[PDB]
Copies of this chain bind each other. A is one copy, B any other.
Amino acid sequence: PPGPPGPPGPPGPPGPPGPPGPPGPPGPPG
Protein backbone atom coordinates (compact mmCIF):
# COMPACT_ATOMS: atom_id res chain seq x y z
CA PRO A 1 0.00 0.00 0.00
CA PRO A 2 0.90 3.67 -0.39
CA GLY A 3 2.71 5.14 2.59
CA PRO A 4 1.32 7.62 5.05
CA PRO A 5 0.53 11.20 4.13
CA GLY A 6 3.63 13.38 4.31
CA PRO A 7 4.48 15.89 7.02
CA PRO A 8 2.37 19.01 7.28
CA GLY A 9 3.84 21.90 5.36
CA PRO A 10 5.77 24.75 6.89
CA PRO A 11 4.16 27.92 8.15
CA GLY A 12 3.10 30.38 5.52
CA PRO A 13 4.63 33.74 4.71
CA PRO A 14 4.25 36.63 7.14
CA GLY A 15 1.13 38.70 6.60
CA PRO A 16 1.09 42.17 5.04
CA PRO A 17 1.99 45.29 6.99
CA GLY A 18 -1.05 46.69 8.80
CA PRO A 19 -2.99 49.75 7.74
CA PRO A 20 -1.60 53.22 8.38
CA GLY A 21 -2.31 54.58 11.84
CA PRO A 22 -4.89 57.20 12.74
CA PRO A 23 -4.10 60.88 12.31
CA GLY A 24 -2.23 62.53 15.18
CA PRO A 25 -3.64 65.00 17.65
CA PRO A 26 -4.46 68.54 16.65
CA GLY A 27 -1.45 70.85 16.81
CA PRO A 28 -0.66 73.21 19.64
CA PRO A 29 -2.75 76.36 19.87
CA GLY A 30 -1.26 79.35 18.04
Chain A interface (Cβ within 8 Å of chain B)?
1-30
Contacts and interface: CB of A to CB of B under 8 A. Distances in A.
Contacts of A25: 20, 23-24, 26-27
A22 to B, nearest CB: 5
Copies of this chain, whole number: 3
Contacts of A8: 5-13
A24 to B, nearest CB: 3
B18 A7 contact: no
B18 A28 contact: no
Contacts of A11: 8-16
B20 A27 contact: no
Contacts of A28: 23, 26-27, 29-30
